[PDB]
Amino acid sequence: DKWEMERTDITMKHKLGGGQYGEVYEGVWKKYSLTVAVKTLVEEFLKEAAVMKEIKHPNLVQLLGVCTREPPFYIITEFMTYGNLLDYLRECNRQEVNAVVLLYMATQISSAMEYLEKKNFIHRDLAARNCLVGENHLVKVADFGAKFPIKWTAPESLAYNKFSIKSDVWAFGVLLWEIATYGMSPYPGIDLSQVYELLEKDYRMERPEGCPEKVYELMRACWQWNPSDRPSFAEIHQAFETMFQESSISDEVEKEL
Amino acid sequence: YDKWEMERTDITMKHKLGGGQYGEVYEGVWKKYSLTVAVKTLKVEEFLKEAAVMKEIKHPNLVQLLGVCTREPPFYIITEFMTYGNLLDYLRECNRQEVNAVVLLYMATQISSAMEYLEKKNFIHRDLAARNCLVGENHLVKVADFGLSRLMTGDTYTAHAGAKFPIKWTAPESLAYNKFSIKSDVWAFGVLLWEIATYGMSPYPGIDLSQVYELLEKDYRMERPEGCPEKVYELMRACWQWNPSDRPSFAEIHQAFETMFQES
Numbered sequence: 001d002k003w004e005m006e007r008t009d010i011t012m013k014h015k016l017g018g019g020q021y022g023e024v025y026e027g028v029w030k031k032y033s034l035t036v037a038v039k040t041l042v043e044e045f046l047k048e049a050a051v052m053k054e055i056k057h058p059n060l061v062q063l064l065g066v067c068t069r070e071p072p073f074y075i076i077t078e079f080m081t082y083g084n085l086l087d088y089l090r091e092c093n094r095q096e097v098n099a100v101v102l103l104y105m106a107t108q109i110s111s112a113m114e115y116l117e118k119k120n121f122i123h124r125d126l127a128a129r130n131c132l133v134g135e136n137h138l139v140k141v142a143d144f145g146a147k148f149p150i151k152w153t154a155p156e157s158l159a160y161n162k163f164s165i166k167s168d169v170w171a172f173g174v175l176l177w178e179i180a181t182y183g184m185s186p187y188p189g190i191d192l193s194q195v196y197e198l199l200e201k202d203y204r205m206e207r208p209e210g211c212p213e214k215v216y217e218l219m220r221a222c223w224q225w226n227p228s229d230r231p232s233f234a235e236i237h238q239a240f241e242t243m244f245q246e247s248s249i250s251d252e253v254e255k256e257l
Numbered sequence: 258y259d260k261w262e263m264e265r266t267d268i269t270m271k272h273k274l275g276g277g278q279y280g281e282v283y284e285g286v287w288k289k290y291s292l293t294v295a296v297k298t299l300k301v302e303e304f305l306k307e308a309a310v311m312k313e314i315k316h317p318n319l320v321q322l323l324g325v326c327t328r329e330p331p332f333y334i335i336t337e338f339m340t341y342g343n344l345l346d347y348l349r350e351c352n353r354q355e356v357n358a359v360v361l362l363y364m365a366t367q368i369s370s371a372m373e374y375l376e377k378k379n380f381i382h383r384d385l386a387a388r389n390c391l392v393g394e395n396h397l398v399k400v401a402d403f404g405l406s407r408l409m410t411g412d413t414y415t416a417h418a419g420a421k422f423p424i425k426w427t428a429p430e431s432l433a434y435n436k437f438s439i440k441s442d443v444w445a446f447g448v449l450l451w452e453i454a455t456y457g458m459s460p461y462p463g464i465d466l467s468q469v470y471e472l473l474e475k476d477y478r479m480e481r482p483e484g485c486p487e488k489v490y491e492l493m494r495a496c497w498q499w500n501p502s503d504r505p506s507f508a509e510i511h512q513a514f515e516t517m518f519q520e521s
């Protein structure tokens with residue numbers, strides 16, 4: 001189909017970010033001299049390729065082409081010039097990447113998730129390490145990959161192996177906490193083998209330093225024990241666009257002073 | 258239909274805002290931009306007079322009209338939604354180490370900037386108070402007018418001159434001769450300043466409404482509240498000059514806050 005391209009069109013450079021993403025390489029799509037990202041390799045691979053042709057949205061990593069006729073196989077996406085969000089936040093300049101920016105990043109991510117909610121997709125591994133940063137603080141959600149990230153995992157997935165858009169809502173709340181702490185690890189110091197029983201007894205992380213009340217209110221809503229008591233991503237996204245607009249106006253008033 | 262008219266199906270109506278706190282105002286969604294909005298509904302000339310007034314007011318610190326639905330009943334007036342609600346309850350509930358002196362200065366500055374605009378456009382507010390302001394993310398403050406004398410029960414509004422007045426916000430010339438002007442808004446702003454410095458205490462605490470007029474005419478004024486800076490208290494007092502023409506203009510008040518805010 002339209003997405004198939006010759007492996008010759010791509011100059012495969014070297015493996016991306018010290019291989020921390022696995023078999024994903026920096027590449028050059030030669031006809032356009034365009035730096036791209038290339039996943040190489042089995043039927044899960046083709047399933048991923050099949051899914052990525054079905055999703056398009058400003059804040060989801062954009063598929064550019066595939067190579068699926070003979071090995072080795074390629075999934076080709078855009079290259080995001082600032083890398084993954086967790087490392088960005090951990091190394092950023094906090095006076096440039098300030099509260100208006102942090103809010104902008106959460107708004108974009110909730111936008112991607114509302115889109116996946118709308119098309120009935122589930123993410124299953126939402127976290128800062130799975131998001132990418134471009135120019136102008138553009139953020140796009142991606143998915144790089146008995147092995148959980150327990151600290152991002154909703155109670156019904158720990159206990160019953162049930163995943164849903166609502167367990168992505170749970171993980172979105174933890175991602176908010178990652179943003180608010182510029183990429184600290186959640187539940188600081190807490191034995192991850194006791195997290196399930198702590199959650200069952202209504203333990204949650206306290207508001208991190210500097211986090212706005214309403215953002216923390218949304219985190220706590222994301223962390224409701226019942227999946228059905230959690231907000232939809234449409235509700236979360238609406239709350240963030242409304243906040244982001246208020247914050248942008250306040251930012252301009254402040255500059256004008 | 259003019260340029261503000263919007264199709265009803267552009268809005269998802271969700272539920273009464275504050276559950277009826279504000280009367281026939283609903284929380285809604287402007288779907289195409291994923292924005293929460295406030296929607297005022299007619300359960301008529303006065304309704305459309307309000308919409309017409311708001312079509313002339315565009316300022317960062319005033320509530321912004323987004324559209325109206327006037328093709329068939331029920332009629333809608335649509336504005337933005339402010340995440341943190343009204344300023345009075347916000348001040349009463351906030352975390353004071355987060356909402357500190359510089360944020361209070363910032364909120365007063367934004368409110369004075371909105372009133373300077375109303376002054377320049379020759380509008381009068383007539384009911385300026387913390388309960389009529391809204392707070393948004395990143396300490397945004399916007400001035401609104403909810404028509405609260407109709408909705409609010411309690412001692413805030415009391416009968417006077419065949420009307421309802423917030424006595425403790427009302428300038429003397431308005432209490433006495435029912436005369437309202439931008440200078441009686443300047444009086445109310447001084448009281449609003451005192452609401453801010455006290456994180457939302459009721460003005461003239463412990464003094465009965467029956468006493469307020471006589472006290473003000475005999476030159477009583479509220480004391481500087483604990484922690485309020487002296488130059489901010491000086492502005493309050495200038496706002497509470499007995500003769501309306503001795504009160505400062507909102508242009509002057511905003512300039513004074515501008516200067517203060519950048520020295521901090």
Ligand SMILES: Cc1ccc(NC(=O)c2ccc(CN3CCN(C)CC3)cc2)cc1Nc1nccc(-c2cccnc2)n1
Pocket residue numbers: 016017021024037038039048051052061075076077078079080081082083084121122123124132141142143144
């Ligand atoms: C090279 C590649 C191959 C495949 C993918 N795929 C995805 O990112 C993805 C996102 C969402 C889904 C949707 N899916 C639906 C169902 N559930 C279960 C899972 C998610 C699937 C794949 C991305 C990439 N891009 C990628 N990968 C790793 C690193 C980088 C990268 C690193 C640094 C700078 N720029 C880019 N870029």
Ligand SMILES: Cc1ccc(NC(=O)c2ccc(CN3CCN(C)CC3)cc2)cc1Nc1nccc(-c2cccnc2)n1
Pocket residue numbers: 274279282295296297307310311320334335336337338339340341342343380381382383391400401402403
């Ligand atoms: C939905 C609506 C419809 C109309 C209005 N109108 C005004 O706010 C207003 C402000 C200034 C004037 C100027 N006017 C000029 C002269 N006269 C004398 C008085 C003032 C007129 C109307 C607001 C709203 N918004 C509104 N109403 C109630 C509650 C809320 C609300 C509550 C919580 C969070 N966010 C929003 N929001």
Ligand SMILES: CC(=O)NC1=NN(c2ccc(Cl)c(Cl)c2)CC1
Pocket residue numbers: 098099100102103104106107176177179180181182209210211212215
């Ligand atoms: C160290 C520090 O002060 N962090 C604070 N986090 N803020 C924040 C703003 C918007 C969002 Cl969405 C989130 Cl999650 C957090 C503001 C500043």
Ligand SMILES: CC(=O)NC1=NN(c2ccc(Cl)c(Cl)c2)CC1
Pocket residue numbers: 357358359361362363365366450451453454455456483484485486489
């Ligand atoms: C309880 C308490 O300490 N209140 C004080 N109010 N201050 C204040 C600063 C600027 C302005 Cl414009 C205003 Cl109105 C008040 C600072 C702190």
